[PDB]
Design a protein around this nucleic acid. Structure first.
Lengths: 232, 178, 120, 100, 51
RNA sequence: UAAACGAUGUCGACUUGGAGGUUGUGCCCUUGAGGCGUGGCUUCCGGAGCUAACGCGUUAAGUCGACCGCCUGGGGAGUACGGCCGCAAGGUUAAAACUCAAAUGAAUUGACGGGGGCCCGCACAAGCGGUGGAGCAUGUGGUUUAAUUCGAUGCAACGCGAAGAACCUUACCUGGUCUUGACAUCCACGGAAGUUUUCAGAGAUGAGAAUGUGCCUUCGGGAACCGUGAGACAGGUGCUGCAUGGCUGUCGUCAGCUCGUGUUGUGAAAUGUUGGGUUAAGUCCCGCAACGAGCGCAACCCUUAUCCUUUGUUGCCAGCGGUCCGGCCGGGAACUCAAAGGAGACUGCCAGUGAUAAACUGGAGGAAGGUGGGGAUGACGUCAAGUCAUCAUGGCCCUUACGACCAGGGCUACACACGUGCUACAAUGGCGCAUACAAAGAGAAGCGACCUCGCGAGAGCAAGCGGACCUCAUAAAGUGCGUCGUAGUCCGGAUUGGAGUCUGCAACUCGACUCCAUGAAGUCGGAAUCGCUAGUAAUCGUGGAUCAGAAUGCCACGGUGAAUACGU
């Protein structure tokens, strides 16, 4: 069982990070542990919505949550009250008062984690699992993308051995450093212990959603940039 | 193994004389990476040589590197129940480097109060062919004259060249049995 | 011809250029073919026996010129022949094409006139 | 895991403030070279038993996230295994694969 | 790189921190106001102390 | 007698043939051990039929024909037994109880061959340097006490999870102490929590003094937090890694792995994934019933080099001024220089080779020609690899505990063996006196100008810091002169005695720094034992993560920097 985790290597180039703050080294640990606490305790509060990702940000004296969802209204709730109860309890958790926006919604029928939640659910309910993994791949390629790998674990059918299976189709590159590729490792339970589904799904080799700046220092910003050349 | 033949880095004539024979020497004179010390030693040796004879500073240096030279090495390549040995000819770049290594192997135990004197003096000895690596050159040729009987996997190899639509003489080339 | 894949490394463009070349040589004179053909033209069977096998299972009428080690068996019209002598195989090919093609030249004009009765 | 390493981390901060604040320069003032023919009195240095747990010498911390022993890193509040785990999913700011 | 044992293989991570200065030869009070009114970042920390 | 056979019972009749091996005989330029004509055995090839598969195929194992011999699962038994034959072992027809669920004909693929051969990795070779032997340092087993805690053991563990072990930390052990709990939520009853402070007790822990009365309130009482008591529960290094989830290691950059789909086989399965040519590569040209395609490899990617370019301080000063010729300042951009736009290199040009071809090599400018140097970077998977101890978690146990605070002891013990790295055994050096230029980064438990104290180091005090400012930091090897010869020295400096300095209740075994005196092991190590193709190996110093105080380790950085890569 070989390979570094695929999204772990991309975070310095053309993929942005899972959290975005600055804390000047000494406070970096208290801020990561608070960022982790707000992640752990908040996803339980929106249990009743559907969500693909969570991105947490700490400006000065403020904590700003960006959240990614199956549709724009779900977390928002009735008259904005539902998201105001989220921002109330992130303020309670955090060492600062809190702000929250919902992102733009993108490929919710193809997301890594909303497909892997669906496949575990079969396992949770003890179905024979005869066609399940193939029908996962079929519907995922029928709804979009260019390739999918599924790997299923958890001692299938309740066996007293390890017993896996997996299925890859189309194109799934593995060592890629450029563009997003969406991977999720689910962990979920059934009667006999932990079962879990791994979903790599693949949209494209080029995503521009983070790139280096257009210009050198001199043509960007101020027209009059020039110095005196002495006269201390 | 190895799909094609690959070459090697090249050492470059010394900054104080303009000699390749010095530049290959300074390299086998190197101790703990410290080539600029082995430079002072090489050039201080050459001035001591020039005091024995002022007719060239490189005179006894260059001829020592002709006289103590090995041409041959002994290889092992099994025949059945026994390994035996087959001499093979050494490439000029290693002929030179073996010969320089041996002058400097002897010079560093010679007990003179500087490696510059020791080395210059072991070039005086090996220059006349009376010194320490004259026996070492002779011993290495004795093995090549004595072991001229045996060949590399000899019983099957003699069939293999004629059977691979190769020639009726021992093929020195990849994918013949050697 | 637009210039479109030649960016980045030489490797990514060349492994496509070279494959484009292998395909172009193999397919250039069959490239527009929309479906399984109406007849099958054999001038020699010696390495291409399989093209004849598959054609017969797809129910296509077979026109063969078979060599001396080939069998006359299992096709709809055969010419018994031989595979050697480059002057013989050239004459067999010149002859086949004329009978089908100028029958075809006459057919195409006929077909417009046949089709037009319906639309009238 | 153990509750004892979490119980420790909580206990040190009220006791840092309680014992230590009055005692800050007190090792230097009453004992070391600053006590040249001044103080050097046992009866004012028998008081360093109280700050014993509140000492700079017991700020070894270990993980804040898990409470997990051994192999610690102050810059995450984590250890080797647990850093790598958060880093795989992109949870640590600025963290990337190294190449040079 | 593994959860337990497997000593040889390891993992290596880098974090860079980039410093930019600008160097305003005289800042107007209206620049300090605009910095402070329009603040919201996490990706950059601006330090307004001097040295 | 047996392996008495085309791995056909006999013979016989019928069934497209061609050709070989080789032979009667008519004919040929008597023009392949040749052809035709007409017979021959004997045999290869393949069409019909036949077989489970090999195989047979006109001489059947086809199409059938007649008649005889003979079988009815293995083992034990081709023996026993009876009749007959044979000096005589044997020969001849030929068996059961009993034990047992298989034995046996054929084929696929792996691994493998010591049957034949090709191909790859620094795997050998071609060498080079280190370790095993010494000392210290550190790890494992053996061994030991209260206990010296574990996880991990052919190349995947022995400088590894467990990056800093006097307590704590830190698995353990002992002594102290309480049970909803030394940490959260919840209730009953008292105290605000927080702070300052005496005393008993090792300290945990308690009583008491003195500051404070916040928070909410039918103004009872309570939360926060503590004391005290139950449960639900927190807690558990609590067990099982053929029960798992998550994740990764090994081979290995192995050079391979697979999906869709056709055909051949009754199917398991082949074929493609193998050949020729070419590569770092299943890379790519040609191509066979294999066709089309994807993964790894390929790519985007950072980093650096020269080199163009802009910025111009906490960066710089060819020149010029004030002037000791110091960017201190009139002043300068020529200039490194920092981070970023990027530029250059594409087997593309040109030449030769190579099957048209990928590609290797040459040619030319340039820092550089072989995708520039370096890294990112490892398909799928047996290995029952390895973690229940990051963490998820069923099965499943105590929860006055398989929990936790406080002190002391411990891994680093010591008897040795074994692993690893450092530093050495020399003189390439050490010694004295003089002498030189770094890079890159770190510094709110932290370091720190100035300062005064100090024998170098250091020290305590303190403005201060955000690190291109100030500091760690005195970079070292190397450079100059004289000196030294295998004697443990002119190398190596452990031990140990003593003083001056440090972080802390505390420095004895288990902590740090400087320094004075004397001073052992070791003269390059049999078995053993590894990395390495070039900024590599070698060797020297420096910084850092961790970090009270411990670095030989690990991690990154810069100095000086090699033998050869023929051959398989």
């Amino acid at each position: 069982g070989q390979k570094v985790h695929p999204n772990g290597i991309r975070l310095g180039i053309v993929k942005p990070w899972n959290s975005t703050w600055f804390a000047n080294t000494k406070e970096f640990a208290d801020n990561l542990d608070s960022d982790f606490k707000v992640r752990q305790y908040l996803t339980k509060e929106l249990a009743k919505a559907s969500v693909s990702r969570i991105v947490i940000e700490r400006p000065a004296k403020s904590i700003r949550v960006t959240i990614h969802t199956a549709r724009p209204g779900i977390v928002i709730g009735k008259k904005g009250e539902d998201v105001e109860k989220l921002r109330k309890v992130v303020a309670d958790i955090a060492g600062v008062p809190a702000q929250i926006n919902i992102a733009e919604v993108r490929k919710p029928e193809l997301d890594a984690k909303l497909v892997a939640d669906s496949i575990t659910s079969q396992l949770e309910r003890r179905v024979m699992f005869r066609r399940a993994m193939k029908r996962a791949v079929q519907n995922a390629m029928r709804l979009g993308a260019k390739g999918i790998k599924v790997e299923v674990s958890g001692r299938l059918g309740g066996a007293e051995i390890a017993r896996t299976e997996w299925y890859r189709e189309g194109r799934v590159p593995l060592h890629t450093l450029r563009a997003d590729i969406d991977y999720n490792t689910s962990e979920a339970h059934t009667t006999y212990g932990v079962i879990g589904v791994k979903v790599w799904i693949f949209k494209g080799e080029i995503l521009g959603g983070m790139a280096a700046v257009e210009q050198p220092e001199k043509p960007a910003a101020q027209p009059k940039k020039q110095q005196r050349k002495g006269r201390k | 193994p190895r799909r094609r033949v690959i070459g090697q880095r090249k050492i470059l004539p010394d900054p104080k004389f303009g000699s390749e024979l010095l530049a290959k020497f300074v390299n086998i004179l190197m101790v703990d990476g410290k080539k600029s010390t082995a430079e002072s030693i090489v050039y201080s040796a050459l001035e001591t040589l020039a005091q024995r004879s002022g007719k060239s500073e490189l005179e006894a240096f260059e001829v020592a590197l002709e006289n103590v030279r090995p041409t041959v090495e002994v290889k092992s390549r099994r025949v059945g129940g026994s390994t035996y040995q087959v001499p093979v000819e050494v490439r000029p770049v290693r002929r030179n480097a073996l010969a320089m290594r041996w002058i400097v192997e002897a010079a560093r135990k010679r007990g003179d109060k500087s490696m510059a004197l020791r080395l210059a003096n072991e070039l005086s000895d090996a220059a006349e062919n009376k010194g320490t690596a004259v026996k070492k050159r002779e011993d290495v040729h004795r093995m090549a004259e004595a072991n001229k009987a045996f060949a590399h996997y000899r019983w099957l190899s003699l069939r293999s060249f004629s059977h691979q639509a190769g020639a009726s003489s021992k093929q020195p080339a990849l994918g013949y049995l050697n | 011809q637009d210039g479109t894949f030649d960016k980045l490394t030489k490797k990514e463009a060349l492994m496509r250029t070279r494959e484009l070349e292998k395909l172009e040589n193999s397919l250039g004179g069959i490239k527009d073919m929309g479906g399984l053909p109406d007849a099958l033209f054999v001038i020699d069977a010696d390495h291409e026996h399989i093209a004849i096998k598959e054609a017969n299972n797809l129910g296509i009428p077979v026109f063969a010129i078979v060599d001396t080690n080939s069998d006359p068996d299992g096709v709809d019209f055969v010419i018994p022949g031989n595979d050697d002598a480059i002057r013989a195989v050239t004459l067999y090919l010149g002859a086949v094409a004329a009978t089908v093609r100028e029958g075809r030249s006459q057919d195409l004009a006929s077909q417009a006139e046949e089709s037009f009765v319906e639309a009238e | 895991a153990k509750q004892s390493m979490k119980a420790r981390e909580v206990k040190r901060v009220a006791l840092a403030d309680k014992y230590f604040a009055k005692r800050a320069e007190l090792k230097a003032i009453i004992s070391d070279v600053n006590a040249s023919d001044e103080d050097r009195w046992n009866a004012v240095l028998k008081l360093q038993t109280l700050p014993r747990d509140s000492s700079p010498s017991r700020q070894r911390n270990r993980c804040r996230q898990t409470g997990r022993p051994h192999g610690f890193l102050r810059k995450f509040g984590l250890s080797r295994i647990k850093v790598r785990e958060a880093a795989m999913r992109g949870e640590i700011p600025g963290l990337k694969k190294a190449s040079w | 790189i593994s959860p337990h044992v497997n000593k040889d293989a390891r993992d290596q991570y880098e974090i860079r921190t980039h410093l930019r200065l600008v160097d305003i030869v005289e800042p107007t009070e209206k620049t300090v106001d605009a910095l402070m009114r329009l603040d919201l970042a996490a990706g950059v920390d601006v330090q307004i102390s001097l040295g």
